[PDB]
């Protein structure tokens, strides 16, 4: 119901009041415990509001010869860690308050997955369906030009990212404009933006990054007995029914990695309909069907579902579409026990209250929806390294692994007086695939799993410390606030 | 039934010790060690960050553990004898097509068992 | 304790066998079957994608299995005797309101036992 | 091997009862009690019902329970004897640097055993 | 049909006087057992797990609860459960309306031409 800007400030104030006394304890300045609380409450007053907001009004020229002035905004919430990171939205519904809110969310999201980026967010007020491809390029490049001279884009100041109505195509124009004009003398000019194509300096494994992040986000809690015991489910993914809402980029890879581990997708719903099949839906069949006709309506191996996709009887619900889809109205009717927020703030704070009362696990967005942001940090490092991950180590590591297995083979053959080839030590079926198909995608996906797993322990620890139970969101915001605070406190 | 237990009483007086006196606690500790092994193994796999997965005996198992007496071994051995001997009667009945004539199945079984002792012992 | 174990030594000479000589490997293999049965059944319930669920004995259980000797059975039977005999002294001391007079409770305990064998023998 | 089992036959005739005659069902019912205890302990924790988490013995353990004979015990005890005796042979072959002369290591152990019975007797 | 409050005590009092419960269905599922279901064991199972699915002494029944072959059928749930399209497929000879208006008038016509005794709601549910 309420605007998202009202939500993030409420999440911050709730986490700031809980972590306040622990910040004063671990703060070891040369003051008494009364002045230290003034510093804690003083630093928290700095982190909460956005530091910089650039309102723009640049002109473009349409193909018909007409003139048009475009309106755009970009907010930098925190500068405690440079550069700033965030997406760019090309919608009509974009406002400044909505930009400052998602900019603050990016700050706390980056801190959860231990990504050293300040939160940022951008948005121009156009509808891309009303502009041609050539017109969209002039809007993108000119927007990049105006952000560059005002210090709102660059490899060490602000690194934008894709968002709604924005893909890798816009990121190419953004990196190309900066690398040819203001940042021509910058050796890392192509690190000014992420989400780029592989040809323009992108990283492998980016398309399925956010989808793999929501899988490892559920997996880290689906395999913990203490959390599954509070619900009525056994640990594991076998015979787990999950519903995907919004068959977009995240929803496509979310169901593919859940179906891979034994989970059965019983329903997928978008804005134009919802299909249903309690015996499972093949992700590959639905992906090829979505590509052909641009909609999941009329799937052969499924039946139309004339009802709310969020109220389907299931175990896991994955909202991966629009904002505020679970409010005080439909939340008391949700049958799922685990809610994985594949989108940015799809649950109202009032629905969070009854979800905690109904004993329903809600994995928060600032942790679970950070898979793409994690490898966006990896793409930024890749452009700084000027080389793909594993380019210099793949053959070196592969030869070392074959040396290790051969050392076991020869040592055992010599121990028992057998000639060569008698005791073959070969990699397993899984190890052989990880060796032959070794690519940069393999390293960034394992690095994403390491980040999502390690962040899950930090959330489980502080939630268990403050007896927050199934309130994963509060425990997540307490982790982010405490991390940003230590950067401010230990600096002066 | 009583004859079978009378055989057990004869063995107890020969063993000069009641049944279970030497083993009741040794098996009790083993049972708790197996359940504790499954508990720590499951906590290592699914409870790495807080929470215990208690593996406790059932109501019927806890009664067999807390109230473990020689009577429990005797009656368990009696049921073992009545079960095996019943199948021996059923096998002989279907062998000679005796149907519901269990008595003839039992006397044939008893006569055959007594004869093999006499025969294999030899007379000469 | 020594008297109780001397009873076990007397029984062992009558059995002409050490305790466990006939059953040590049988118990060891059955326990490894039970743990594998819980493992094989749990891995079937939780699938194979989540990884194997190894169920192994605890540190104390592994030591009890590998170092299985007659002393373990004797010391377990001794603990069983001392435990049960303690409940008899506590019961008699409470029935006669002796409080901390465990000695008197131990003598009425024994006198009542020797009397019962004498009485029902006629 | 036959000598070891012949020792068990002598003990069997002294016990006047077959091996396992009084414990086969008691041990089998406990084996099912341990598995069901794990099943009911997991279904209670995760809020399941009935046989949602079935815990059955393995196919090998099923063969152990189904058809347990006195033969199974004496073969397990024979395996326990041949194993422990093999360790005693390897131990003194290593101690006396006998290498592959297992016969000498076996006679050295037998002589030491027979000697200890004489010496400690008087 | 419907193990709420009426169906619980209807099953309890019928089983007490010799009758045998064969199937119990709800909006969650349907259990079945041809040799009787205990009302007390079903009441404790419904109270514990919040539903009736997974009863240890009753196999599941994936067919229609109203079409189970029996002698007496007790609708105790929603309005208009017996309908013109499903009336010619019932097997019970007595339909004990343990709920208000569970039979359509067209189903009443089929139940009348088939010699099926329907005890109305305004008397039985009183
Ligand atoms: Cl509203
Ligand atoms: Cl332009
Ligand atoms: Cl509920
Ligand atoms: Cl570098
Ligand atoms: Cl070779
Ligand atoms: Cl080979
Ligand atoms: Cl918790
Ligand atoms: Cl046969
Ligand atoms: Cl004797
Ligand atoms: Na599969
Ligand atoms: Na709200
Ligand atoms: Na609380
Ligand atoms: Na004896
Ligand atoms: Na035969
Ligand atoms: Na006399
Ligand atoms: Na040697």
| Chain A (208-227) residues lying within 8 Å, Cβ to Cβ, of chain D | 225
Is-contact B19 B73, C-beta < 8 A? yes
Q: What distance in Å separates residue B48's CA from the closest CA in chain D? A: 16
- The residues placing their C-beta within 5 Å of ligand 1, an ion, are A 1
CB contacts, 8 Å: C29 with chain D: 64, 76
Is-contact A193 A141, C-beta < 8 A? no
From residue A69, alpha-carbon distances to A126, A139, C91 in Å are 10, 10, 97
SS3 content of chain A, % helix, strand, coil (to 5): 50, 15, 35
DSSP class of A311: G
Cα separation, A452 vs A214, whole angstroms: 9
> Which residues on adjacent β-strands are paired with residue A76?
A52, A120
DSSP class of A347: B
**Tokens representing A353?**
């209250």
Q: Vertex D28, ends E59 and C47: CA angle to 5°?
A: 55
> Which residues on adjacent β-strands are paired with residue A159?
A85
> Which residues on adjacent β-strands are paired with residue A121?
A75
For CA atoms D56, D59, D60, D65, give the dihedral sign: positive
Other Cβ atoms within 10 Å of B32 Cβ, number? 15
Q: CB–CB of B53 and D42 under 8 A?
A: yes
Cα separation, A177 vs A150, whole angstroms: 15
Name the CA radius of gyration of chain A, rounded.
24
Residues with Cβ < 8 Å from C95, sequence gap 6 or more?
A: none
Domains of chain A and any CATH numbers:
1-51 (1.10.287.140), 52-200 (3.40.50.10860), 201-492 (3.40.50.720)
Taking the CA of A459 as reference, the closest ligand is: 7
Chains E and C touch (3+ CB pairs under 8 A): no
Cα separation, E121 vs E119, whole angstroms: 7
* Angle between helices D24-45 and B24-46 in degrees, nearest 10: 30
Nearest to C111 by CA among C88, C82, C94, C81: C88
Other Cβ atoms within 10 Å of A59 Cβ, number? 11
Nearest to C66 by CA among C79, C57, C74, C75: C57
**Residues of A forming the active site:** 121
Q: Are strands A274-276 and A264-269 parallel, antiparallel or unpaired?
A: antiparallel
DSSP readout, A243-306? EEE--SHHHHHHHHHHHHTT-EEEEEE-SS-EEE-TT---HHHHHHHHHHHSS-TT-TTSEE--
Q: Is D107 left (phi over 0), alpha (psi -120 to 50) or beta?
A: alpha
Cα separation, A245 vs A250, whole angstroms: 10
Residues with Cβ < 8 Å from C26, sequence gap 6 or more?
A: D72, D73, D76, D77
Q: Which residue has the tokens 């071994």?
A: B73
Is-contact A51 A79, C-beta < 8 A? yes
Cα separation, A483 vs A380, whole angstroms: 21
Residues with Cβ < 8 Å from A85, sequence gap 6 or more?
A: A106, A110, A115, A117, A118, A119, A120, A158, A159, A160, A161, A194, A373, A376, A377, A380
Residues with Cβ < 8 Å from A259, sequence gap 6 or more?
A: A265, A280, A282, A283
Cα separation, A355 vs E35, whole angstroms: 43
Q: Vertex B102, ends B96 and B103: CA angle to 5°?
A: 105
DSSP readout, A295-356? S-TT-TTSEE--S-GGGSS-SEEEE-SSS--B-TTTGGG---SEEE--SSS-B-HHHHHHHH
Task: Give the CA dihedral A254, A260, A262, A265, nearest 10 degrees.
Answer: 40
**Tokens representing A267?**
């329903």
Is-contact A107 A115, C-beta < 8 A? no
**Tokens representing A234?**
């056994």
Cα separation, A387 vs B37, whole angstroms: 49
Q: Which residue has the tokens 């008087």?
A: D122
**Tokens representing E69?**
């072959």
**Is D29 an 8 Å CB contact of chain B?**
yes
3-state secondary structure of C73: helix
> Which residues on adjacent β-strands are paired with residue E31?
E24, E60
Q: How many helices (H) and strands (E) does chain E have?
A: 4, 6
- Residues shown for chain D: 122
> Which residues on adjacent β-strands are paired with residue C1?
none
From residue E118, alpha-carbon distances to D38, D67, E104 in Å are 50, 58, 12
For the sheet with A361-363, list strands across it.
A303-304, A274-276, A264-269, A241-245, A316-319, A338-340, A361-363
Is-contact A117 A81, C-beta < 8 A? yes
Cα separation, A154 vs A147, whole angstroms: 9
CB contacts, 8 Å: B53 with chain A: 225
Residue A93: what are its φ and ψ, rounded to 5°? -80, 15
Q: Vertex A197, ends A192 and A201: CA angle to 5°?
A: 50
The resolution, in angstroms to one decimal, equals 2.9
* Angle between helices A133-149 and A168-180 in degrees, nearest 10: 50
My answer on whether omega of the bond before A83 falls inside 30° of 0, hence cis, is yes
Q: Which residue has the tokens 């000469």?
A: B124
Is-contact A106 A79, C-beta < 8 A? no
Q: Where are the alpha helices (H) located in chain E, listed in sequence order?
A: 6-16, 39-49, 105-113, 121-124
Cα separation, A9 vs A77, whole angstroms: 12
Residues with Cβ < 8 Å from A141, sequence gap 6 or more?
A: A173, A174, A176, A177
Chains D and E touch (3+ CB pairs under 8 A): yes
Nearest to C61 by CA among B22, B43, B37: B37
**Tokens representing A187?**
């050796």
SS3 content of chain C, % helix, strand, coil (to 5): 75, 0, 25
For CA atoms A151, A154, A160, A165, give the dihedral sign: positive
Q: Which residue has the tokens 């070196």?
A: A396
Residue A22 annotated as lining a ligand binding site: yes
Other Cβ atoms within 10 Å of C27 Cβ, number? 17
Residues with Cβ < 8 Å from A75, sequence gap 6 or more?
A: A50, A52, A53, A54, A96, A99, A100, A103, A120, A121, A122
Helix (H) or strand (E) holding A59: strand A52-61
Nearest to A198 by CA among A385, A383, A391: A383
Cα separation, A257 vs A429, whole angstroms: 20
Helix (H) or strand (E) holding E22: none
**Tokens representing D106?**
């076996």
**Tokens representing A87?**
């997406």
């Amino acid at each position: 119901d309420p605007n998202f800007f009202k939500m993030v400030e409420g999440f911050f104030d709730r986490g700031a009041s809980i972590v306040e006394d622990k910040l004063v304890k671990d703060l070891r300045t040369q003051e008494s415990e009364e002045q230290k609380r003034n510093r804690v409450r003083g630093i928290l007053r700095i982190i909460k509001p956005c530091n910089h907001v650039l309102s723009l009004s640049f002109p473009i020229r349409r193909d018909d010869g007409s003139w048009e002035v475009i309106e755009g905004y970009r907010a930098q919430h925190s500068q405690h860690r440079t550069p700033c990171k965030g997406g760019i939205r090309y919608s009509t519904d974009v406002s400044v308050d909505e930009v400052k809110a998602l900019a603050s969310l990016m700050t706390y999201k980056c801190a959860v997955v231990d990504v050293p980026f300040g939160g940022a967010k951008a948005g121009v007020k156009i509808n891309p369906k009303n502009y041609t491809e050539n017109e969209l390029e002039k809007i993108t490049r000119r927007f990049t030009m105006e952000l560059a001279k005002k210090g709102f884009i660059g490899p060490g100041v602000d690194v934008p990212a894709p968002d709604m109505n924005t893909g890798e195509r816009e990121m190419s124009w953004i990196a190309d404009t900066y690398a040819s004009t203001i940042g021509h003398y910058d050796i890392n000019a192509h690190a000014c933006v992420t989400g780029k194509p592989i040809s323009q300096g992108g990283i492998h494994g980016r398309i399925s990054a956010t989808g793999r992040g929501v899988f490892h986000g559920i997996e880290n809690f689906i395999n913990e007995a203490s959390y599954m015991s509070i619900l009525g489910m056994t640990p594991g993914f076998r015979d787990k029914t999950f519903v995907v809402q919004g068959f977009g980029n995240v929803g496509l890879h979310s169901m593919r990695y859940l179906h891979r581990f034994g989970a059965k997708c019983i329903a997928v719903g978008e804005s134009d309909g919802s299909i249903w099949n309690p015996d499972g839906i093949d992700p590959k069949e639905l992906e090829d069907f979505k590509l052909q006709h641009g909609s999941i309506l009329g799937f052969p191996k499924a039946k139309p579902y004339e009802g709310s996709i969020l109220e389907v009887d299931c175990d896991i619900l994955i909202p991966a579409a629009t904002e505020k889809q679970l409010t005080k109205s439909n939340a008391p009717r949700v049958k799922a026990k685990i809610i994985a927020e594949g989108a940015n703030g799809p649950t109202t704070p009032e629905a969070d209250k009854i979800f905690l009362e109904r004993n329903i696990l809600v994995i928060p967005d600032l942790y679970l929806n950070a898979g793409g942001v994690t490898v966006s940090y990896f793409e930024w490092l890749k452009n700084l390294n000027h080389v793909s991950y594993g380019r210099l180590t793949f053959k070196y590591e592969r030869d070392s692994n074959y040396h290790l297995l051969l050392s076991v083979q020869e040592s055992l053959e010599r121990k028992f007086g057998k000639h060569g080839g008698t005791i073959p030590i070969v990699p397993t079926a899984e190890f052989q695939d990880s060796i032959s198909g070794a690519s940069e995608k393999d390293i960034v996906h394992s690095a994403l799993a390491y980040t999502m797993e390690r962040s899950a322990r930090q959330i489980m620890h502080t939630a268990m410390k403050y007896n927050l139970g199934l309130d994963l969101r509060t425990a997540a915001y307490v982790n982010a606030i405490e991390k940003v605070f230590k950067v401010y406190s230990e600096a002066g | 039934g009583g004859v079978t237990v009378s055989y057990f009483e004869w063995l107890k007086n020969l063993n000069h010790v009641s049944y279970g006196r030497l083993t009741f606690k040794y098996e009790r500790d083993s049972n708790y060690h197996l359940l504790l092994s499954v508990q720590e193994s499951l906590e290592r796999k699914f409870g790495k960050h807080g929470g215990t997965i208690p593996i406790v005996p059932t109501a019927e198992f806890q009664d067999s553990i807390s109230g473990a007496s020689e009577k429990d071994i005797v009656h368990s051995a009696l049921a073992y004898t009545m079960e095996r001997s019943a199948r021996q009667i059923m096998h002989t009945a279907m062998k000679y097509n005796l149907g519901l004539d269990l008595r003839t199945a039992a006397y044939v079984n008893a006569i055959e068992k007594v004869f093999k002792v006499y025969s294999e012992a030899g007379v000469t």
